[PDB]
């Protein structure tokens, strides 16, 4: 690993630590969980909160701030749910097959999201994705690189500078390939698995967009969302 | 009091009981109070919740449902904050000079709204209004009639059928005048005081709209509002 590759890793890890709270102490400020669509208010606040964190993380990705505000938004909107899916793996547990975020109130199973407007058609591959990603047992350096690579994908709707973004992602994919080779024993096949995860996220992204569209078209449900959520997942 | 005047009173009282919970048990579902603009999330959820209740109340006001959807919206948008001000008097206490809504968490003083984006320029006449209105010691029949009269005011922006709405309000003002004369001892001067309260609400409405506009123009603050709140107090 070169010095530049090292600086990139350092800054990305620091960016994640500054935008991911391991105590989940902010969750008490969300609309509380209720166990129709009783879980939608809590989920909406959680997702809205997470979007703000993803934005914070993205702004510290090297090269992202130099992009056009339009490109930044285009990348953010299209990849938001994928980054949320990726970052949520940190709270996911193989023992409980659930997201454990501090207290008993914030221990989320698959049934909770069902009570929030989404179906098993999304949640079944989601949990399967979470299990597979957890089994990869990523270093924090790798998990953090994966989120940055995902966010800087040039193949998103609305992007204008495809070459400048593909270059940034390549430079990031380079770092990831090098790190695994030098710092991760028995990771000879790990990189290919991680790229496959990015492909999994596209299908999950697609299914979420369909189910979100179903949800956002009903005013009684869309009124439970936050302005930020409506703006990020909206078609405007 | 005639039978028709009596039926109107009955239906309005029942409408209020169905849309005003004396236990305030729903308040636990709001984003919790935090004691910048730390109180804005709780206030936003409280106001949003109250708007839904005001809508429920309005739909049961005799003649309101027969109005145009546009007129219903025009009346609702322009008078929403005034009805909220009126209905909040039920939780207001002269002992504490505050709104007491169940537990210690939901005991709101003037400083709480200050921590929610509004200034003393609105709150000082508001509390003064609350004190004066409480001192009138309205019967439930009167307090309920006042909200209905306020809501059916023809002198609002965006209204189209001024004659049909003024007629409904007149018919309501008739009921109020009769009720006070027949059912309220020493209320010889009460009706004039209540009409003066409607005039007070206009000034309070005006000041709120200015301070809301200041708040809604800042995305970091407007993102803390609810879709319903944005829609009702919005200029669209």
């Amino acid at each position: 690993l070169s010095d530049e590759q090292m600086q990139i890793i350092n800054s990305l890890v620091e960016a994640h630590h500054k935008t991911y709270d391991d105590s989940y102490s902010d969750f008490v400020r969300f609309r509380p969980p209720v166990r129709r669509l009783s879980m939608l208010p809590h989920l909406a606040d959680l997702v809205s909160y997470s979007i703000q964190k993803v934005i914070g993380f993205a702004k510290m990705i090297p090269g992202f701030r130099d992009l056009t505000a339009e490109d930044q938004i285009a990348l953010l909107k299209s990849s938001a749910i994928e980054i949320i899916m990726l970052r949520s793996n940190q709270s996911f547990s193989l023992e409980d097959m659930s997201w454990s975020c501090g207290g008993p109130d914030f221990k989320y199973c698959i049934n909770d999201v069902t009570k929030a407007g989404h179906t098993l058609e999304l949640l079944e591959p989601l949990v399967k994705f979470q299990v597979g990603l957890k089994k990869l047992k990523l270093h924090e350096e790798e998990h953090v690189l994966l989120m940055a690579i995902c966010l800087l994908s040039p193949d998103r709707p609305g992007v204008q500078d495809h070459v400048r973004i593909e270059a940034l992602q390549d430079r990031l994919c380079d770092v990831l390939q090098a790190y695994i080779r030098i710092q991760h024993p028995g990771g000879r096949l790990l990189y290919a698995k991680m790229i496959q995860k990015l492909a999994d996220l596209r299908s999950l992204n697609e299914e979420h967009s369909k189910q979100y569209r179903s949800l956002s078209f009903q005013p009684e449900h869309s009124m439970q969302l936050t302005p930020l959520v409506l703006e990020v997942f909206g078609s405007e | 009091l005639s039978d028709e005047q009596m039926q109107i009173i009955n239906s309005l009282v029942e409408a209020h009981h169905k849309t005003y919970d004396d236990s305030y048990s729903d308040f636990v579902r709001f984003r919790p109070p935090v004691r910048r603009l730390s109180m804005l999330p709780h206030l936003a959820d409280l106001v949003s919740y109250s708007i839904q209740k005001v809508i429920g109340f309005a739909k049961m006001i005799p003649g309101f449902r027969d109005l145009t959807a546009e007129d219903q919206i025009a009346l609702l948008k322009s008078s929403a904050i005034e009805i909220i001000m009126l209905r909040s008097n039920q939780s207001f206490s002269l002992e504490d000079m505050s709104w007491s809504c169940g537990g210690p968490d939901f005991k709101y003083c003037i400083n709480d709204v200050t921590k929610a984006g509004h200034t003393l320029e609105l709150l000082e006449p508001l509390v003064k209004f609350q004190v004066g209105l409480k001192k009138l010691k309205l019967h439930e029949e009167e307090h309920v009639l006042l909200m209905a009269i306020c809501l059916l005011s023809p002198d609002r922006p965006g209204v189209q059928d001024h004659v049909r709405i003024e007629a409904l309000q007149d018919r309501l003002c008739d009921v109020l005048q009769a009720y006070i004369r027949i059912q309220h001892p020493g209320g010889r001067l009460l009706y004039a005081k209540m009409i003066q309260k409607l005039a007070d609400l206009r000034s309070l409405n005006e000041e709120h709209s200015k301070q809301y506009r200041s708040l809604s123009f800042q995305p970091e603050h407007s993102m803390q509002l609810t879709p319903l709140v944005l829609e009702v107090f919005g200029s669209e």
């Binding site: 703000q52 934005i55 505000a69 909107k77 930020l228 703006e231 | 970091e220 993102m223």
Partner: peptide
């Protein structure tokens, strides 16, 4: 996208 634009400074 007024919120996003604000959050992106």
């Amino acid at each position: 996208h007024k919120i996003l634009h604000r959050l992106l400074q």
